[PDB]
Each structure stands twice: as structure tokens, then as C-alpha cells.
């Protein structure tokens, strides 16, 4: 026969939202676990998040089934709700992995860092700029490999056969949900972002992977925005200089002076990594997790 919705076994809730709800689903025949994202239509109409939904859907249609990102297998809907059957990341968020031992070692940071950089590289290649990058939306699959979700704030480009879609991201607004610590300075200021924005966020992420806390972590958001706009971040006493230089050339106010992806690839910290041997990036045995 064929495959349909009735072949599924819905289980635990993987986390609700302000307009969405992720529920664990399991194929009764194959055993393959998925993550069904249930969105209430009236909730996205009342707040006009249809553009977010379409940007996410479009990004998922762009980014096909690769290892670095969550993939949308199929979709279905009734009259009140819309359903997104996605990938299931067994090992939760990257933030939880970081908060496991507070910090991470240099080897693991290089590993998962190469993974993340590869993912971002792929996204930028397929004309997708996530803009909103943070350890909250970086998950880990069953075999301990990173993935990227929440493509609602993404940006599209090439206009090859599908056109470009860039909508402003007012961080200081009320519609913005998040901590806004991993937000690029230009994105905070002029409500728009480019490729080096995800690079900035990447720098914040690896900095957090070593130190244990975001580079621009503050009490409120005034001091946060102040730290972002004044570049007020200081490395810890015992901090790897090799990574320190990388952060210093990544976390830069001017996006033009900011280090690009291939430059990060050709860094002294990533000389131990070949980004063409992507069997070593993904299928490698994850190093002993620890601080």
C-alpha cells in the first residue's frame, strides 16, 4: 500500500509555543521518529505571522534533506490547524549540552563548531540567512550531531526561480521573542542583517561554548544593547588564545571588516579540520564530553 497519517503514533509534547506546538510522532511501520509541529491558524492570523510561516516553509523547501538542518518531509492540515512533519532531534538543544558541564572542551568545540560552520555555509549557499541564531534553536540528533531549526526569521536571496523575501527584525519591538544576546549589531540597529550576522552569532555561540556564558550577557536589555553596540566583552582569565583570536576577528562591529566563512575555515583553530571531508565532520565519533 502507501504511507499516510494513520500510520503514525503521536506521543509526548516536545514543547509548546505562542502559536505552535511540537508533538513527537512515530511511524508504526518503520519506527522512524518525527517531530510534528502543530500551528493554530487563527493564532497566526490574529498576529499576522503568515509571513513567518511562509518564510519557514520556503526555507525548508530550499534547504532539502541534508544533515546540518531540520528537514520537512511532508505536510498536512485540517480546518483549524496546519501540521509540519519535521526531523526529531533526540538529544535536545545545544544549550543543554553546554549547560551539562557548564563549559565544553576545545576538541568538542572544534568538532561541533566545524559542524555548525558547515551548516551555516550550506544555508548561505542555498540562499538562506537564518539571522536569528542561538543555542536554543541548535539541536542534537540521536547520534549526537547538530541541527538548525526555527527558520521563521530567515532571509531568502538568489531569485533564481523563487524570489527573495527580506522582512525587518525589530529587536526592541514586542513581536520579538527571545533574549537578543546573539543578535548582530547591524541587525539590532537598522533592523536588517546579512551573511556575517550568522557569523557574529556563531562567534557568540562558540564563545559561549568555551566560557559557558554569552559574550554580551547582561542583567537587562539596556546593558545588553550597550554591550553589543560598544563591543563590551572580555575573555576569561584562562582562555585559549587560538580561539580568542578567532572570536576577536569574528565579533566585530563592522560587518565589512568581519571574518567571512572561508576565512574562519582557514583559521589556526580550524587548520585541524578539512571541510571537504564531511564524513569526518558528521560521522566522527563525538569526543568525550566534558569541561
Which residue among the candidates 7, 40, 125, 132 is catalytic per the annotation? 132
Instruction: Using alpha carbons, select from 202, 207, 201, 271 the residue that is nearest to residue 243.
Output: 207
Please check if 88 is assigned to a binding site. Answer: yes
Q: What element of type H or E holds 131?
A: none
Please check if 19 is assigned to a binding site. Answer: yes
Instruction: Using alpha carbons, select from 62, 30, 34 the residue that is nearest to residue 128.
Output: 62
Please check if 83 is assigned to a binding site. Answer: no
What's CA 246's distance to the chain center, in Å? 20
Please check if 150 is assigned to a binding site. Answer: yes
Known catalytic residue at 170: no
Please check if 71 is assigned to a binding site. Answer: no
Cell numbers found for residue 281? 565532520
**Cβ distance 13 to 52 under 8 Å?**
no
Residue whose C-alpha cell reads 542534537 in the numeric block: 140
Instruction: Using alpha carbons, select from 92, 94, 88 the residue that is nearest to residue 24.
Output: 88
Instruction: Using alpha carbons, select from 206, 99, 94 the residue that is nearest to residue 145.
Output: 94
Determine the longest span between alpha carbons in the chain, in angstroms: 63
Please check if 37 is assigned to a binding site. Answer: yes
Please check if 136 is assigned to a binding site. Answer: yes
Please check if 268 is assigned to a binding site. Answer: no
What's CA 286's distance to the chain center, in Å? 20
**Cβ distance 139 to 147 under 8 Å?**
yes
**Cβ distance 124 to 59 under 8 Å?**
no
Binding positions are 18-20, 37, 87-89, 93, 136, 150
Binding positions for ATP are 18-20, 37, 87-89, 93, 136, 150
Q: Active-site residue numbers?
A: 132
Amino acid at each position: 500500500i502507501r504511507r499516510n497519517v494513520t500510520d503514525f503514533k503521536f506521543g509526548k509534547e516536545l514543547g509548546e509555543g505562542s502559536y505552535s506546538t511540537v508533538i513527537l510522532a512515530t511511524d508504526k511501520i518503520t519506527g522512524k521518529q518525527y517531530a510534528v509541529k502543530v500551528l493554530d491558524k487563527r493564532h497566526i492570523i490574529k498576529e499576522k505571522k503568515v509571513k513567518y510561516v511562509n518564510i519557514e516553509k520556503h526555507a525548508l523547501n530550499r534547504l532539502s534533506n541534508r544533515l546540518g538542518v531540520i528537514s520537512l518531509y511532508f505536510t498536512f492540515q485540517d480546518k483549524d490547524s496546519l501540521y509540519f512533519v519535521l526531523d526529531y532531534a533526540s538529544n535536545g538543544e545545544l544549550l543543554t549540552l553546554i549547560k551539562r558541564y557548564n563549559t565544553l572542551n576545545e576538541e568538542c568545540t572544534r568538532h561541533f563548531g566545524a559542524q555548525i560552520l558547515d551548516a551555516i555555509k550550506y544555508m548561505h549557499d542555498n540562499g538562506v540567512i537564518h539571522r536569528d541564531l542561538k543555542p536554543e534553536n541548535i539541536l542534537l540528533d540521536d547520534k549526537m550531531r547538530i541541527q538548525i531549526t526555527d527558520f521563521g526569521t530567515a532571509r531568502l536571496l538568489e531569485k533564481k526561480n523563487d524570489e527573495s523575501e527580506e522582512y525587518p527584525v525589530d529587536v526592541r519591538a514586542k513581536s520579538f521573542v527571545g533574549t537578543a544576546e546573539y543578535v548582530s549589531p547591524e541587525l539590532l540597529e537598522n533592523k536588517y542583517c546579512g551573511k556575517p550576522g550568522d557569523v557574529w552569532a556563531f562567534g557568540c555561540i562558540i564563545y559561549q561554548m568555551i566560557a559557558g556564558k554569552p559574550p554580551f550577557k547582561a542583567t537587562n536589555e539596556y546593558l545588553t544593547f550597550q554591550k553589543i553596540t560598544k563591543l563590551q566583552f572580555a575573555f576569561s582569565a584562562g582562555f585559549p588564545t587560538i580561539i580568542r583570536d578567532l572570536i576577536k576577528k569574528i565579533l566585530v562591529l563592522q560587518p565589512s571588516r568581519r571574518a567571512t566563512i572561508p576565512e574562519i575555515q582557514k583559521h589556526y583553530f580550524f587548520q585541524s579540520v578539512d571541510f571537504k571531508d564531511f564524513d569526518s565532520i558528521w560521522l566522527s565519533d563525538p569526543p568525550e564530553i566534558g569541561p
